[PDB]
Design a protein around this nucleic acid. Structure first.
Lengths: 155, 128, 94
RNA sequence: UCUGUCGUGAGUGGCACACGUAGGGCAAUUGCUCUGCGUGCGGAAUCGACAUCAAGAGAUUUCGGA
């Protein structure tokens, strides 16, 4: 249950955006693009990949959890630069949960990858980081978004 | 009320005309006119996934003119394959640079010949 | 005059939009015909493959196409003349 | 507190608008007029720009005008 309000706070107690990016998160409305395909339940969103990682290698290392119906690594539309994150569509929910629990931290091309579900069509009110918000973040970069798997709430 | 489309389609089948991408339009054919006259030059751009797009400009084309040619090429590409059409070119040119032989094409006013770019060359992208 | 112009603008500009489109196929065949010419200069070595069949197939295309384009433009010019006839007819008597 | 309108693969698109910027013509060292580009109020410092959602790096403080 995404709430851009409490997402900027460690324990869900903030009633006023401490960052304009939070303020942008509340105002902006988000809908998944036409490139968002497949059943959202089986899309294992992975991030923090190496920009030199190819979509075949992702299929190669993520096939050990079972058969993979579809996969896409996201690259910049005009330039072609890899955006550093992909979307893995699996078959049978047994495979994706196995992908959930073990693949987080799995080193790929000298990077500790991040693994989560697809939270667009499942997490209510979800807002990506580009629209202000998202999850994770780094406290170094003047902002942070708690409530995710990386940074759960201090309840 | 589009009888011209049929004529353009069969005419493209000319073996000395297969280079043309179905819909011809004036700027594309006119650019290839200067190719025969030698005034134009092709500057290849490769996306980071390896796909290459042969952008064509004039010899005296400036860097900023080259930028619009990429916009003209990409935008023309999108309608034919039906991809994303409303490309935020303000953002794309805000974050990415143009580089050739390790030198970033920063001066939009400068012309490609001084930047060392010749015909059938290659330039790539890099972030700010 | 402002609404006199806009009334003329509403009809005359729309006809031109199609007429400019109607003209748009003419310079397409003009530029394409030119492009065909300079590639035959480079076809002095490429003329080994039969250009006569290629040239014959090319020429009969546009001429019928350009004839149909002229026929369509005659329809549009007539309406353009008719709109110019009617629109200026109303403005004097008002 | 810092433009409008139409748009949803588009908080990021189109057009207009405002401001700034580059090139052209005209008049009396300056002024008037057209086309391209940048931002939607405009600057500075600092932290980032190698951040979790199918494409988008911003943010904290500060101070100038209306």
């Amino acid at each position: 249950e995404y709430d851009p309000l409490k997402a900027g706070s460690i324990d869900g107690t903030d009633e006023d955006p401490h960052d304009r990016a939070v303020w942008r998160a509340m105002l902006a409305r988000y809908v998944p693009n036409k490139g968002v395909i497949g059943d959202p339940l089986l899309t294992l969103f992975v991030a923090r990949l190496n920009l030199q990682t190819k979509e075949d290698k992702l299929k190669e290392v993520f096939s050990r959890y079972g058969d993979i119906r579809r996969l896409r690594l996201v690259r910049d539309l005009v330039t072609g630069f890899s955006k550093g994150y992909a979307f893995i569509e699996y078959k049978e929910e047994r495979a994706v949960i196995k992908a959930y629990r073990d693949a987080d931290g799995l080193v790929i091309d000298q990077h500790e990858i991040f693994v989560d579900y697809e939270l667009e069509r499942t997490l209510k009110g979800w807002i990506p980081r580009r629209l202000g918000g998202g999850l994770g973040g780094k406290k170094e970069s003047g902002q942070l978004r708690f409530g995710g798997r990386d940074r759960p709430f201090r309840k | 009320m589009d009888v011209f489309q049929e004529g353009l389609a069969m005419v493209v089948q000319d073996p000395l005309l297969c280079d043309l991408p179905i819909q011809v339009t004036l700027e594309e054919v006119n650019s290839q006119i200067a190719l025969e006259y030698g005034q134009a030059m092709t500057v290849r751009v490769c996306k980071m996934d390896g796909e290459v797009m042969p952008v064509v400009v004039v010899q005296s084309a400036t860097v900023l003119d080259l930028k619009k040619a990429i916009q003209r090429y990409v935008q023309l590409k999108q309608e034919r394959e039906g991809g994303i059409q409303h490309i935020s070119w303000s953002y794309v040119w805000r974050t990415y640079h143009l580089t050739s032989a390790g030198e970033k094409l920063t001066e939009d006013r400068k012309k490609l010949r001084d930047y060392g770019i010749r015909n059938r060359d290659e330039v790539s992208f890099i972030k700010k | 005059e402002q609404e006199l112009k806009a009334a003329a603008d509403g009809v005359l500009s729309e006809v031109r939009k199609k007429q400019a489109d109607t003209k748009r196929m003419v310079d397409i065949l003009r530029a394409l015909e030119k492009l065909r010419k300079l590639r035959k200069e480079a076809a002095a070595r490429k003329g080994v493959c039969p250009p006569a069949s290629a040239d014959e197939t090319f020429t009969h295309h546009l001429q019928r196409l350009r004839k149909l384009i002229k026929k369509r433009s005659e329809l549009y010019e007539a309406e353009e003349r008719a709109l110019r006839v009617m629109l200026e007819g109303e403005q004097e008597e008002e």
